[PDB]
């Protein structure tokens, strides 16, 4: 069986070559446990790479490109064999073939090489695969090509350390057009690619925003498929980690009522946790951005999550309420208190996460300054919010934080007690 396939690919007869390349392809196209290792050991990989350059025989090109796609879909050691036989520059060249079938297979193959690791991803981009990949993207592009290329594009952006920004910047106009598709697969892969490009410094977020993605990304927060929603939510969340102007791009497109609906629907814990992290990066902004959070009606259900939800959700909801106390106005902080935020912030003071203790302590302190301003202005006998902290059992918790190992938590507790309980 196999010594006839090797002889066929190693023969110089066009029909013998196509017959055994189809046989090798079929053997590599099997469901689970493909004999990729045995196909490599048969010494046929360099012949398939040679069969890629045969532009007078497009059927063999496609069969050889599909067999190499499946070898490149295995282990890193299998992907390296494809790289060592110089397939990467030949697949970039095959993106300019008269055959739609060869172009599509070359796109998949490069996606599989770029998918292996940041090193392999970097080799594909250094071989200039990005521009010709984007060149076969237009209004006459078939759905199968739109899906293969959008998935390859996501692999070009994928991994840590991230690719150079100048290297993935040409992708942004194409990705902004691809998120307008109604195909869930295209949407999933374009959202994944945008979640990678937006994960970083503010100069990256700025370019993502200038491509005009914010209105369509907000709409995608309401996509019924979680496959779309997960990278959509992550992209929105990465954009709002930028400056106030960058964060405003998302808020202007009614994202806050959309983010609220993710907190009130019967959704996965990981989706609610991400919505809370997103909201927290918005309450980390200016007084107008906090107002928009208040206006959307998020504070109420956020305070309930801060009190009743699973620890990972409570963590993000803690950062969201505390951020609002940090940048917020006097009357906004008071609105947070009237929505019942003091008790749940107090209850997380004995929490084993020192970061969360510090966040809730800062939130309670910010609230205390406001309560003090009300006392001074009205010549009152007591700080109303210091009474509420004591009623919520928060006072005894702050007094106990004087025994905490952490200096920052200790020094905070002492500073709070000296300024409000002497």
């Amino acid at each position: 069986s196999l010594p006839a396939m090797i002889g066929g690919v190693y023969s110089d007869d066009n029909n013998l070559q196509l017959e055994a390349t189809t046989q090798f392809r079929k053997l590599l196209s099997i469901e689970r446990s493909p004999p990729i290792e045995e196909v490599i050991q048969s010494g046929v990989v360099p012949r398939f790479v040679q069969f890629l350059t045969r532009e007078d025989f497009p059927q063999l090109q496609f069969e050889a490109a599909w067999a190499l796609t499946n070898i490149a879909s295995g282990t890193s050691e299998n992907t390296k064999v494809v790289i060592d036989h110089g397939a990467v520059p030949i697949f970039v060249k095959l993106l300019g073939s008269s055959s739609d079938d060869v172009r599509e297979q070359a796109v998949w193959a490069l996606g599989n090489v770029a998918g292996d690791s940041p090193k392999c991803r970097d080799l594909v981009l250094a071989n200039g695969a990005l521009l010709p990949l984007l060149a076969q993207l237009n209004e006459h592009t078939k759905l199968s090509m739109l899906r293969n290329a959008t998935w390859t594009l996501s692999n070009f952006c994928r991994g840590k350390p991230q690719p150079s920004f100048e290297q993935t910047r040409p992708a942004l106009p194409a990705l902004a057009r691809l998120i307008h598709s109604n195909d869930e697969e295209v949407l999933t892969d374009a959202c994944w690619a945008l979640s990678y490009l937006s994960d970083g410094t503010n100069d990256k977020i700025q370019a993502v925003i200038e491509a005009g993605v914010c209105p369509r990304l907000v709409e995608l927060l309401l996509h019924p498929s979680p496959s779309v929603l997960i990278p959509a939510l992550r992209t929105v969340g990465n954009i709002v980690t930028g400056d106030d102007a960058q964060t405003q791009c998302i808020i202007d497109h009614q994202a806050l009522p959309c983010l609220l609906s993710l907190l009130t629907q019967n959704l996965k814990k990981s989706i609610k946790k991400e919505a809370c992290w997103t909201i927290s990066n918005i309450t980390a902004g200016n007084k107008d951005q906090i107002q928009a959070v208040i206006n959307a009606g998020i504070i109420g259900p956020l305070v309930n999550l801060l009190q009743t939800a699973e620890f990972d959700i409570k963590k993000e909801a803690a950062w969201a309420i505390s951020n609002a106390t940090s940048g917020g106005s006097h009357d906004q902080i008071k609105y947070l208190v009237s929505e019942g935020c003091i008790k749940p912030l107090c209850d997380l003071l004995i929490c084993p996460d020192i970061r969360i203790v510090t966040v809730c302590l800062e939130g309670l302190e910010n609230i205390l300054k406001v309560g003090e301003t009300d006392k001074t202005l009205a010549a009152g006998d007591v700080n109303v919010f210091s009474q509420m902290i004591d009623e919520a059992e928060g006072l005894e918790k702050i007094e106990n934080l004087q025994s905490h190992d952490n200096n920052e938590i200790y020094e905070k507790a002492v500073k709070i007690l000296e300024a409000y309980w002497m």
């Binding site: 490149a72 879909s73 295995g74 994928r158 999933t188 892969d189 992550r234 990465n238 980690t241 980390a284």
Partner: peptide, 21 residues
């Protein structure tokens, strides 16, 4: 404060895809 916090959990699609047909 307040400070903007980047994502601390790794979220990504499928690295490789095998062509079955």
């Amino acid at each position: 404060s307040a400070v903007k916090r980047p994502a601390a959990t790794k979220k990504a699609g499928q690295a490789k895809k095998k062509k079955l047909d």
